[PDB]
Write a protein that binds this ligand. Sequence first.
Ligand SMILES: [Mg+2]
Ligand SMILES: [Zn+2]
Ligand SMILES: [Zn+2]
Lengths: 79, 50, 1332
Amino acid sequence: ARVTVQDAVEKIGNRFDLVLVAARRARQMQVGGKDPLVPEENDKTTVIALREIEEGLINNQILDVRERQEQQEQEAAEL
Amino acid sequence: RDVHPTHYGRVCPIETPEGPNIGLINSLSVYAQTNEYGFLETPYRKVTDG
Amino acid sequence: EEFDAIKIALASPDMIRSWSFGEVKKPETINYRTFKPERDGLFCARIFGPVKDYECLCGKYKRLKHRGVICEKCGVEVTQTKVRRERMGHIELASPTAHIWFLKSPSRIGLLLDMPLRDIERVLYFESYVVIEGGMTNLERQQILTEEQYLDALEEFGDEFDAKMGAEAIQALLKSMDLEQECEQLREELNETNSETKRKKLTKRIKLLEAFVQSGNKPEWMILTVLPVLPPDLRPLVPLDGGRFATSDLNDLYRRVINRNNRLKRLLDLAAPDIIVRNEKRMLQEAVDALLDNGRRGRAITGSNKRPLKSLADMIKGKQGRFRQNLLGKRVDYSGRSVITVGPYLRLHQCGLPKKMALELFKPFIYGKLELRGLATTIKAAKKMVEREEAVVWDILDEVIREHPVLLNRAPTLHRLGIQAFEPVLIEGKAIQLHPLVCAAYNADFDGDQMAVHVPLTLEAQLEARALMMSTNNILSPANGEPIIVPSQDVVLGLYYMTRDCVNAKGEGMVLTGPKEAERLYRSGLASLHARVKVRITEYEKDANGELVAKTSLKDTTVGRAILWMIVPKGLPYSIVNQALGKKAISKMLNTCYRILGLKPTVIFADQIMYTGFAYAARSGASVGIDDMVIPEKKHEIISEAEAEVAEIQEQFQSGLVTAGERYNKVIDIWAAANDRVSKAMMDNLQTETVINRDGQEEKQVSFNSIYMMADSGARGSAAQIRQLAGMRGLMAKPDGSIIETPITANFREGLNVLQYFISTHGARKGLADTALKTANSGYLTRRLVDVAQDLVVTEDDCGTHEGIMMTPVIEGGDVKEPLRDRVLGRVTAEDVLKPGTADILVPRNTLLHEQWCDLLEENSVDAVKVRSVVSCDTDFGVCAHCYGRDLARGHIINKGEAIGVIAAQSIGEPGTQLTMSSIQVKNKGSIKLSNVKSVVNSSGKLVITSRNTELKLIDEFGRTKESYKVPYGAVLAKGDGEQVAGGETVANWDPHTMPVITEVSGFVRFTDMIDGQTITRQTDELTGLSSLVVLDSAERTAGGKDLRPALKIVDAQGNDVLIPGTDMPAQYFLPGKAIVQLEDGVQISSGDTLARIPQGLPRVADLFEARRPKEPAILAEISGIVSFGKETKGKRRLVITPVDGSYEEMIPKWRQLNVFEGERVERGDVISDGPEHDILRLRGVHAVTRYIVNEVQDVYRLQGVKINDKHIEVIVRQMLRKATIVNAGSSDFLEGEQVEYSRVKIANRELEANGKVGATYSRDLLGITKASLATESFISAASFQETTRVLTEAAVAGKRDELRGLKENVIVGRLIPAGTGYAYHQDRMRRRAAG
Ligand SMILES: [Mg+2]
Ligand SMILES: [Zn+2]
Ligand SMILES: [Zn+2]
């Protein structure tokens, strides 16, 4: 959280992907403004994204499975 | 930039700057004046026969 | 927008007109009153652009009445402005003139023609003519003709020869010539006579000729005919605020072309006489080069400043230009400076900040939040609501601030940890607050050293300031395995007072129940910080698997030692806090804390070691004065007892006995021999002089001095710094630096003399004039160390290739020096390695070597193991994590994506600033090893050797060596190798002056091959009588026997030569000078007795990396075999070697002493001269090349107290070896050296099964590392920093291109760096090339 993002690296496996997979996560909530999964606890968007990470909730695949159902469910709406 | 035994009496060993001009600037000690030529003199007392 | 690569070539004069917009024909810039751009001028609107919005000059086409219409009266359009930077102008010359990058420097144009620059300089200066083309074959091309011999070439023939004297005369020589006739005729005779110094010009031109062929460059463009003019936002003409103007320099320089070109085309119209038109075209190239290189060709050119001008290239040359100062480093918004100050209440991830600084800095972030609040309505409204002091201004400020971390910076940056990223806390001040514990990370203290501040505005870098650079992510420095939160001054002192073992405190002996209740007793005045009290505790261990197992025990401990147990998170023994807790124990007590419990407890822990360290100092109080420093009474007599002796050898010096050196070396000793004992004067008088009485008579314990508790703490110094206070302060010296005869008898407690203060400046002003230029020499050395490492980023997990270097200790010289396990620690094993009970292989060809697997190797007595280095890794364009082991900074398995080199280039160049300031005896008992030995049993019984490679090494019985020392060729011993040697027994002995020529064979002597007057003298011993034929030195004797090698033949009674045991080689000593053979004729000498005796830094680091050979290289043995000697001193001695089956004779400076004799056998890997020792790369392997260098410069740091992991230097040795000279051909060129990786490419496509053998074999090469950055495939990586004129000539003659692959390339162009967070990007860019 405020002090530590080490447990956030024993989840993914990479210090640099954490800079990417949280930024891809928080950009759906910075200006995309979606619902967060953890409660807020009066924190900015970068802190709820890392608190999301520790319980195994936002991965590289979970950032893409969440969109790929959402892509075709949007692409079953245009026609 | 460094001292030498003729410095004593004429030029102080403690009022220099520190950085890239440490050995270029000096300051003359309180008792000295100069010559008609411009070489520094510095007083002493003589001892005639003890 | 986006572009893949770039390209550079010579620009044609057709390309220039297609680049441009209009021909600048008049020097007028602005009129004298109407400040206006000028028609057909330099700032012209008809060429370069518009200025005001949709507004022409005279007022015909305005206000979008006529969209695409030029005001044809004045020549000016209406269109969109700000093209005054993009839109270049041009100019067409009348006489063509020459580029100065392509002429002055090889010349690269006269180098093309093999024509001298002095042959050019009669032509392009208008001194004498030259031929263009002899029509008749009587003359030949490239022939300078003087103007008087030109008329003879006129009046002979007239029409059958063509010759000018002009720049056109060189221009005609480029249009005329062909290359396919030349470059296949240079092909024709490269095979005729390939002698090198003629063939190296056949190497360079078949480059240079065929450079132009396949690329598309032409050398016609190499002499200018058209010029491009800089768009006037690069050459402005600006006013000041006071109506005064100030221009760029190039408006002046461009002016000198357009006038002097004008008074040629007008002077052509009037047909000036043929003397003057020459000087007309002289001045153009005088003033064209004034643009390119002001002070290059002749005398410098200055103006009204009376100082030289900044040229066109001087905007790219040096650090005054744009590569070194305005592209890599920059200016920056969103930043500021202030002064530092401490905080004893910030936690580690926090830091202070002013309000007035942040509210002024975070002004773009407030104006977004106020509209989301709506108290401010618009933007200009919200700016108004800053000055009006709203409570919501400081309720949005903190709400902007919270979880937005912030960089801080300090100069000089010396390594990675100079920049960090804390979290803000506000305070009501105007000075940047800072944690105290980060002062080890900066080598800084609080004397007003300012610090920068920076904000990561984007989302992504804000995460980098939290995931990468947040100050609790990185505690462990990349130099070693000890952290950088070694507690600095008072936290190491507040402990050392508190943990102590005296008997003074009341309450000692009764038992307590828990470390809570000591609060109830010590504060009440029934307890003392140090009182030795039995206490029952409850510690915790992890003897299960990650699970706490309880135990509870009692400890006869002290009270202050017990209160530390209130914090420590139940994993450490009570024995770890059972000491005095100096700086030695505390830093390991963090190291052992995260050795066991992981990282995150040791960031909470160091927080609560700082809060106590001031708090029990605030109980204690540390006070100093004059009374604390005590002089013992043994000061009067100890100097007086030598003061009677300083007149003693002076009185010898009045008797005329002692020389200068023997008296100077004795007056320096006895004046300082007692100074050695003034440490013994203050030890027993000031360590246990205390007398506190406690249930006995007295007590001998620790001191109550409050000084020796400060140095065993670790705050400032140790027991050598008190010697300048309590005793006398050593000796003194001159800034020349010779050691003084009379040292000091006074100090800082009694009072020095007016002369003792005079000469004290000498050691101090020099001592600051030394280091004030020793910070320059490291900011040099760092800057090129980061340039060889600018390509190094990991690629793959494994190469899986052959094994590499071998891990052994460095224990030579004295005792243990480096533990093998620590050099083992952090790595991956290379070879399948076992335990000393056979075949217990602990690796599956690779194991990560952390500290518990290091404990296994310390357990077994085995001490040799192989570990992959960067040399045995062979992934292209990177290294592998299976050959790096542990990233020392993060402290676990190195991932994929990280940098390698620049962390080591920050590691190695950091403590360069902190750096610059007989008989061999056995030590203990054990085993004996001395191998690679051929020796003899002497006339005394013991091992006497007659070989070079032998030396003594002392081992224990287990196998792990204690000592080793060099023994000379021919050393007399007292025990045998492979025996038992007791401790303290004299093994070896030899005279230092002589190197023995001791007889290994045993035969009679005979005075052969020397007759007195030819190669020798007769020097009989007038005292003894015993003297043989006395050989003389190299210059005194007669030349009539100087071609005859003088040999005392070993003969027997029949007349033979007594052979060596084993060989049929004759045994006679070809004895060189000064070697007086003792015994006369007919005497049998033994085996093993002398026939003749032969009696007699940081720029040091800048040899070891800058790839320099010494001035006195010690030659090795080229090829082995039975060697003879050679020629007699035609400059130097030659060496006739004849191998056992193989195939050289070369110079020898014979005025030094040789090693191997005229007929002795030598093996490769042996010096043939004496001295210090590229050759070891030429004839030996690869690993031993890296061995001597790593074991020399890491050795330097141990001498002056630094520790650096040897991998960092090994990282450079891989970047020190990139190239490979080639022997054969068939696929490519023949002998030019090339990239070793690419030399491993063409074996894998052509020497592999496409063809049986068509390739070319190759060794390893070695550049200087200051030019290995200049000798590169990328060129802007080489043009950014050094010699920018040269590297942009040769890049353009060949038609190079770049791939933007180095990380200095992606940073200048605004791209993302190919490392770290951006490496996971750049491979998608890399995979999109191969797929589309
Ligand atoms: Mg300071
Ligand atoms: Zn107009
Ligand atoms: Zn490898």
